[PDB]
């Protein structure tokens, strides 16, 4: 039944993630979503790095949370200056 997987999703997740130290981070990430700190799209993107290979599992997880596929992309290199410093003149 569809219930069978969900009651075992964390067991299936635990086996693949392997070592506990990586499984703990998987739980912490799942926590932040349930605390409304982490957005759903950001959660699915992070879970991808965990459950990416298990396509049959990751697809189920994407189905479960309701993720639907198809600015803040600032980039690491560049930082914004304040408005005042931009006034130094050009003739």
């Amino acid at each position: 039944i569809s219930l069978n997987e969900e009651v075992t999703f964390f067991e299936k997740a635990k086996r693949y993630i392997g070592n506990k130290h990586l499984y703990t981070e998987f739980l912490k990430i799942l926590n932040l979503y349930s605390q409304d700190i982490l957005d759903l799209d950001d959660l699915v993107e992070k879970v991808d790095f965990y459950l990416g290979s298990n396509k049959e599992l990751f697809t189920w997880f994407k189905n479960f949370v309701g993720y639907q596929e198809k600015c803040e992309a600032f980039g690491p290199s560049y930082k914004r200056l304040p408005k005042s410093d931009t006034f130094m003149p050009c003739s």
């Binding site: 219930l3 969900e6 009651v7 075992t8």
Partner: protein, 153 residues
């Protein structure tokens, strides 16, 4: 003293040696009929608690922290169950706040965790279904005098 703390009135007493307070035989958490008396001490629940833990805070916190972890079945009622053993019995007293409102007063395993997770999920499903279904039969009832589907799927 002269009065019984749990009868709230003057009573014939069985007395714990360590605590000066003594109680009437009737209000005994385990009934203790005067005819049959314990040997000398008769340690009260509050006194029995101190000697049991040996008046140690670290064990007290530990025996507490063990008690909560032990009763993972009912966690929210953990501190409450832990405390009730220590406190000496007391007569039921109607609390002031309920009294204060009224104008007048007269008298003054591993598979178990999966099973425990599964059934709640399973119980959740029908509730989700029947609420979604009842909106659907509200949709057919939105059509007046007859259901839009005219039947049940």
């Amino acid at each position: 003293e002269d009065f019984c703390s749990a009868c709230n009135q003057s009573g014939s007493f069985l007395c714990c040696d360590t605590c000066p307070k003594s109680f009437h035989f009737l209000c005994l958490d385990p009934p203790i009929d005067p005819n049959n008396l314990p040997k000398g001490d008769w340690h009260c629940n509050e006194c029995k608690f101190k000697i049991f833990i040996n008046n140690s805070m670290a064990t007290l916190k530990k025996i507490e922290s063990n008690f909560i972890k032990q009763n993972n079945n009912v966690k929210i009622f953990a501190k409450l169950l832990f405390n009730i053993d220590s406190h000496n019995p007391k007569q039921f007293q109607l609390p002031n706040y309920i009294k204060e409102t009224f104008p007048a007063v007269k008298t003054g395993d591993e598979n178990s965790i999966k099973y425990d997770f599964f059934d709640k999920i399973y119980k959740s499903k029908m509730v989700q279904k029947r609420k979604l279904f009842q909106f659907q039969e509200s949709l057919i009832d939105k059509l007046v005098s007859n259901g839009s589907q005219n039947g049940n799927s």
